[PDB]
Subunit: 388 residues, 4 copies
């Protein structure tokens, strides 16, 4: 086996087609399905799998009570076969913790989980299913990472971490791993003012990450990483099509180098594909809450502070709950280009649906098509009343 190199451009995105959906909450009403949140998708050279943070209980289990909670000793990164639900019997534990990332370099998979109390957390880096390196908290305030897949080039896999405040300046680092070993780390540079939960993808130009500014911004910060030189820059998506949640209404002029103001101390993990005229942005439909999901074709969104949509696709109706979203691609697929993909976390339960005492999710996932395909909408599909 050889390390994968990022040698192709993105395929032209003219629409999105259904890729996967697990209907986990529907099935878990009467099956041993693990409570999860913060899911993602990641491919190996021979298989693509769903990933998420388990809560160490099933949905019907009495221990599902209180699972709105973010960080406990009972969480772990698990993976399971594409479009199956995360069950007790089919889920593989990658590592123990409450914040994660994972990616395959072409030879083996690296998985990283962070665990610990708020003031003493640590990352353990696994490679080929063995622990290889460990990183202690540097700011003693909830060391945390991407919650979706990392990306590798010629064996080098960059990962973005943040340690420090969720509501002010924090200490973000970009780590460069190879075979789970730390090659290098560097402090965040550039104009992004707050960085959390980066969603990344790679192509011949380099690695692009779209992140969450949890402090002042409702535009999304972007980190662009050169995995060969092991350097990066940062800024914001310039477009006035704002893609954080909650967020103000779309103005006519965005901000390239500072947070767009209006909503403080909140946000959601999200993603984009920034590729000139082939640029597509994801966002919740609601500006107030994690509901609905849409894709919008916004040419040169990264660099054009006046850019507006020229095409779109609804993924989840505004009437339905969404949640986290992130990017992944099958780097090992056939063809001359990388097909852009994404997932949307469909959160059910608390805080929005409080007649149940749990919080979980299901997953829907799409990839791009060069066709102009008809659109459907993709709800979680569970009826909360059945759980009462």
């Amino acid at each position: 086996r050889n390390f994968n190199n990022l040698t192709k451009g993105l395929c032209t995105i003219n629409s999105w087609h259904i890729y996967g959906k697990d209907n986990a909450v529907r099935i878990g009403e009467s099956s041993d399905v693990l409570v999860t949140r913060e899911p993602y998708v990641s491919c190996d050279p021979d298989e693509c799998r769903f990933y998420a943070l388990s809560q160490g209980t099933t949905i019907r289990g009495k221990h599902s009570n209180g699972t709105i909670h973010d960080r406990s000793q009972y969480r772990a990164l698990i993976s399971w076969p594409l479009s199956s639900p995360p069950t007790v019997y089919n889920s593989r534990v990658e590592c123990i913790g409450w914040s994660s990332t994972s990616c395959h370099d072409g030879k083996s998979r690296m998985s990283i989980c962070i665990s610990g109390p708020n003031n003493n957390a640590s990352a353990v880096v696994w490679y080929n299913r063995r622990p290889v390196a460990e990183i202690n908290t540097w700011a003693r305030n909830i060391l945390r990472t991407q919650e979706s897949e990392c990306v590798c080039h010629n064996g080098v896999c960059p990962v973005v971490f943040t340690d420090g405040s969720a509501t002010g300046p924090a200490d973000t680092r970009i780590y460069y791993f190879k075979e789970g070993k730390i090659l290098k780390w560097e402090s965040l540079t550039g104009t992004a003012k707050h960085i959390e939960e980066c969603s990344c993808y790679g192509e011949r130009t380099g690695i692009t990450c779209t992140c969450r500014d949890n402090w002042q911004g409702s535009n999304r910060p972007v980190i662009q990483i050169d995995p060969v030189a092991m350097t990066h820059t940062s800024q914001y998506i310039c477009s006035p099509v704002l893609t954080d949640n909650p967020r103000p209404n779309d103005p006519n002029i965005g901000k390239c180098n500072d947070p767009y103001p209006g909503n403080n101390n909140n946000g959601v993990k999200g993603f984009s594909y920034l590729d000139g005229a082939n640029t597509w942005l994801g966002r919740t439909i609601s500006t107030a809450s994690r509901s609905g999901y849409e894709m919008l074709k916004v040419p040169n969104a990264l660099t054009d502070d006046r850019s507006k949509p020229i095409q779109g696709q609804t993924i989840v109706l505004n009437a339905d709950w969404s949640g986290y979203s992130g990017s992944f691609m099958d780097y090992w697929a056939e063809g001359d280009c990388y097909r852009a993909c994404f997932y949307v976390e469909l959160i059910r339960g608390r805080p929005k649906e409080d007649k149940v005492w749990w919080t979980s999710n299901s997953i829907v996932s799409m990839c791009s098509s060069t066709e102009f395909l008809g659109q459907w909408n993709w709800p979680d599909g569970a009826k909360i009343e059945y759980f009462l």
Copy 2:
């Protein structure tokens, strides 16, 4: 690995022997068995598996309520080991959608699922477990396909699609795929007047598909495909042994080039093996409803408008519910001929059994023997009262 070529004739069919049966509804009374419908069987070079459209819920789950419904966002093509039931824990999702086909070409498997609203549906073509091609609706009226396996020759796998009315002229296309890529498509030609849910098999002569005329005909339309030239013809089974359901009583003269009249706007997926004196037709025993199933040896049924049975075998008693039926063969088995096989869907629940609120099925499957074997009958075997 090499692409499979269709180089053999059919084995002589003198009776049918039991091949597989999953007892899914019996077991699902107290196990996490997925609600399904539209099942089939398909072989890989090293394994044969059951396939069906899941409804994204188990039978005992409260979400089984309403599963008479044909098209929802919670359906997916799943496969699972031969004669096991389709469980949450053993089912592999092939793709997402509510109409499907799947076949192995000798090297890898192609699976096709259609999803979307009635007026904006699309097919996604998967090959070696990756999405490769997409096809948008051309008539904006429930794009739909075979609901049983396709067949390949030297890497070319033809698939029959229909888009348009279920009760009048529609737009049927034959697509020719290789490694999931579209080589060619063509509009239906010949004398078949309405085409749905083709059941196909291959042999040295070419590929033969027996379909459902949902409009005016109670005889079955036939499409014969040359996978090398990538051309086809169509007509009806000439025999007065009528094999659609519901249907009129058998006359003494059938129709080769037009629907045999009596029942409009209905039908069921079915199959036949058309092989001169070795011809066998499948049909429900009832002329009114999906109950019972029998095989009838009808020499030259395809071409002889006077042909009647000379031998038969009851598969499912008239007193027991049947449903869809279709053809498959193990193209990778040893020997000098291809052994004809088929499955029968045994539908339980709605609309016929309305004391439960779900609709599901189990599977029975047979293959041919050159012996003259004794016959049994093969009911689903579940007692509906247990589910109340």
Copy 3:
């Protein structure tokens, strides 16, 4: 891979050690464990597995009601990992039917299942997981076979079948298969007067089968098969240590060539290892019912009509229910001799425990040791009251 040859003698049997136990009924009180009966054990070159006839329902499922029944359309031969219980999720279906045998020839496994009504049953012979040959009933009276593993030599695998009365002369045939194909069959010859449910093992001398005379005999008939010449002989175990159930008390003179009288029209599947001074016989402890199980060292039991035990080992206490027992060996193990093994079916439920409406079993299995090991006893271990 090469066909296995029987080139070794039996290891010296000085005691029996625990080999496997699945505790299926205990676990099935609260897990999705399939109802079974007629279990056995059989080895592949790389794995040994448990086998049994499923009833197509779990124990806790309502369809377990009535499973005392021997022959239904919902039965199948299943296999599952050694000492695990037969669950819905881990059981592999080998073929469909209500009487079976199975064995590996060194290259692939042959499995045979019989299904059908009493007067029209048929065997389907599977090889490398594909149907290869079929055999129709020859006496139209419950065609039936071993219910434990067959044995192969240089690709030839003999199997004993019976068709006809359970209470008078019947038509027994020995079939010789290779790669699932029928090489030859022959009618029973020799002095055995009634043959059912043969338990077989192989060694350099040939294949030895210990069977059940259901008609007049309480001594066990023996068939000795030469798999090279494809011929056989038959007689009874000469020893007055009688090993059928029910049975008279042990006399001082047994019968070599005729049934030992006292109990008619009943019996149980059992086994022995006939090896001169290394001979061990299995039997229920009770003479009246299927309770208890013991092994007895009876030198030259096959040929000496005065032979009595000189050593023994209790396997299951008389106070505990037993059932069928049969032989198997790991022909692919290391060393200079074949280690004798056996299983005992531990039947729970009806007819002996009629407060439940089901009949199932668990399995215990032992292999021989050249040590003189201490003995324990091995009950099923389930408490019937828990199922009420």
Copy 4:
């Protein structure tokens, strides 16, 4: 494949990081999780797995009643994927019995299970999943072994057994196996006065086992084994940091060659890593009961009868139940040193929590880091009240 050789030293231990945790009791509240106790961890060259003694019932099953019991016919050594819980559907049975050890030699795994009544127990030694050797009780008083992994060097795998009193002098033997065959055994020599449940690890110096003196000592006995010469010595950990439970308070002078007095006829399985200045000891926090767990860096603990801690890490808070603990390492990991690892059994149910009628456990596991990582605590996490 080649036999593994112990060619490296221990990595420098500066802290411990989370390795695995199965949350078995939490999940088993509503899933088919087997009741277990006496768990451990052991690695193959390509996978690391959890091990334990099943009780042949799930936790929610009615047969969980009475599982405080140590030795029954329904126990077996099972293994299952790292950090998954031991379920009916994912657990592999290694052998049948109520005391065990298991280890991989680089080519295949040896597993040993002891079963039988107190006065007639026997060990069966399995190699590459086949029974190879058997050992009868030599003192007729609960033949018993390590309850955690053994260690191999160049194919030789030493195992410590004890037969005889739990409250006075007993007969301890060290057996040396290769491919499951007995090379040699020897009686215990040295100054250890009572030996049970040895926890072992290997490195270039040889194999080191830390055991339980159940008779008079609250310091732990140590056996040091040379697997090449196949010889051993024994003594106690000299340190006044006492690590058995229950135990007296830590004095200022320990005992090298005799039991440290204060608590008789009790103990718990435990472990240590004895490596000069890199020495770390594990122990329960409570001196009275199996609650809490901590690691303490005690330089030269083995040889220095005045040695005290200079660093530590809490693993489980005193308020939470612990239990057995033992050592394992991934001998097949990359790098120049062996990374020390351990597990802690977290016992729930009886005798400490008697509102339920069962006894089970979950597992937490850690490995060493050369970093000085922040510490968390790792409770079982289940709420007993949910089981009422």
